[PDB]
Copies of this chain bind each other. A is one copy, B any other.
Amino acid sequence: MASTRCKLARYLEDLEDVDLKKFKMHLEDYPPQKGCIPLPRGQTEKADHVDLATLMIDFNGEEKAWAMAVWIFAAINRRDLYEKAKRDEPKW
């Protein structure tokens, strides 16, 4: 029942040291024909697991932020979290 900001923070909180690096690297180079906007390298590189989820939402809004998170989870082969996100997607 909490805000999306907490949902997203919890999943990002589940990514271990390397996974986070790879996730950040997908955010910065997000493919440019999906209506999503890539993130600046500086802010992302310095940002923590709860400063990363507060940036993704600010840049793209809830709907798009969730889609990005799901897609990137698939892209870095974290299928446990990919399946959990897809089954726990809010009804917008």
Contacts and interface: CB of A to CB of B under 8 A. Distances in A.
Interface of A: 1-3, 5-6, 9-10, 13-18, 20-22, 25-26, 28-31, 37, 40-43, 45-46, 48-51, 54, 57-61, 75, 77-80, 83
B42 A75 contact: no
Contacts of A50: 18, 21-22, 25
A75 B40 contact: no
| A interface secondary structure, majority | helix
Contacts of A3: 29-31
Q: How many copies of the polypeptide does the oligomer hold? A: 18
B42 A14 contact: yes
Contacts of A28: 5
A72 to B, nearest CB: 10
A83 B61 contact: yes
